[PDB]
Structure 1
Amino acid sequence: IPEYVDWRQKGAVTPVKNQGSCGSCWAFSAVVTIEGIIKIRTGNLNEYSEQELLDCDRRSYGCNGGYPWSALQLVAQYGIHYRNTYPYEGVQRYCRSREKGPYAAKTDGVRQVQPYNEGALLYSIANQPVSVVLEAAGKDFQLYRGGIFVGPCGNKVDHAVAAVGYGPNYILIKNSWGTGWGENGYIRIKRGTGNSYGVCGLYTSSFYPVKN
């Protein structure tokens, strides 16, 4: 795999979103990987509905949090609507997939990256955007304004984001806190520290959709 991967340069990343007050990071995370893999497989970049995952993933808890892997299973089992048809409301409502006609996209499945393994994560990111989790509760993460982030942070992972690239000394992360946070909405997190958790627990739990 190359020394640098940046899926934004391959036109595989949609603009940065702001999840707002709702704890829907897991659905934003999931959607980034769906948007990425649909572009990689079909050549079209589209935006898909975080709101639909929020309303329709019964394993998750709406704005109270959820599971990227569960949302990814939803999309493989059923599909997902365009974001324009099922726009983000920042509040869990009832699942409106049937009202909004046929799904715009469907995946074939969900894989887990083998946890606590930096090379396994980078291999996956070389192929497509990957849903990853990290500890975002710490003030240093929240006030991040740019640079390679090394922490301080612990391993109490609480926030699902999407890795859309990496370099020699960082993993490139699309966050869902708007374009004002971090590096236009992105964070570069240090890798290769020999901490198998990853910094801020980045290697704890990573998933990507499969599409054939």
Structure 2
Amino acid sequence: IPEYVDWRQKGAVTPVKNQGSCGSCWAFSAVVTIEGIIKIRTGNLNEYSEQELLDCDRRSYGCNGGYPWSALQLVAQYGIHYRNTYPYEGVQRYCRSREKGPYAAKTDGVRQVQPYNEGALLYSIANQPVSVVLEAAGKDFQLYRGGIFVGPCGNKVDHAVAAVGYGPNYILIKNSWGTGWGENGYIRIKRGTGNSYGVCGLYTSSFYPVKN
């Protein structure tokens, strides 16, 4: 795999979103990977509905949080609608998939990256954007305004994001805190420190959708 990957340069990444006060990071994370894999396989970049996952993933807990892998499972079982058909409201409501017509996209499954393994995550990122989790509770993360982020942070992962690239010394992350945070909404987190958990626990739990 190459020294640099940046799925934004391949046109596989939609604009940065703001999840708002809702604990919907798991759905935003999942949607990034869906937008990525659909562009990679079909050549079309579309935005898909975080709200639908928020409303419809019965294994997750809406704005109280949830699981990227569950959301990715739901898109593989059922599918997902376009974002403009099912826009983000920042509150869990009832699942309205059936009221909004045919699904716009569907994946074929979800795979987990081997945890605690930097190389395994990089390999997945070279193939497509990946859902990853990190510890975002620390003030250093929240106040990040740019640069390669080294912490401080623990490994109490609490925030799902999407890895959309990497470089020799970093993994490039699309956050869901709007364009005012970090580097136009992105963070570069140091890699290669030999910490098996990754910086801020970044290697704890990573998933990506499969689309044949």
> Shorter chain as normaliser: what TM range?
over 0.9
Q: Deviation string for 1:127-171 (max 9, x for gaps)? A: 000000000000000000000000000000000000000000000
Indicate the residue corresponding to 1:170 in structure 2. Answer: 170
Instruction: Report SS of the residue matched to 1:99.
Output: helix
SS of the counterpart of 2:155?
coil
Percent identity among equivalent residues? Answer: 100
Q: How far does residue 104 in structure 1 lie from its aligned partner after superposition?
A: 0.1
The secondary structure found in structure 1 opposite 2:146 is coil
Displacement of 1:189: 0.1
CA deviation digits over 1:92-132, x for unaligned, max 9? 00000000000000000000000000000000000000000
TM-score of the superposed pair, with normalisation by structure 2? 1.00
Secondary structure at 1:48 match in 2? coil
Structure 2 CA distance for aligned equivalents of residues 114 and 97 of structure 1: 32
Q: How many residues align?
A: 212
List runs of 5+ in structure 2 lacking aligned partners: none
Structure 1: runs of 5 or more not aligned: none
Distance 2:12 2:55 in 1: 25
SS at 1:163's partner residue?
strand
Aligned partners of 2:17 and 2:146: how far apart in 1? 18
For 1:63, the equivalent position in structure 2 comes to 63
1:172: how far off?
0.1
TM-score, structure 1 normalization: 1.00
Supply the distance in 1 between the matched residues of 2:17 and 2:158 (Cα, whole angstroms): 18
CA distance in structure 2 between the aligned counterparts of 1:121 and 1:2, rounded to whole angstroms: 13
CA distance in 1, matches of 2:93, 2:87: 12
Q: Give the alignment's Cα RMSD to 1 decimal.
A: 0.1
Match of 2:110, SS state, is: strand
Alpha-carbon distance, 1:184 to partner: 0.1
Q: Secondary structure at the match of 2:192?
A: coil
Query: Could you tell me how far 1:2 is from its partner in structure 2?
Result: 0.1
1:204 Cα deviation from its structure 2 partner: 0.1
Query: For 1:50 and 1:154, how far apart are their aligned partners in 2?
Result: 28
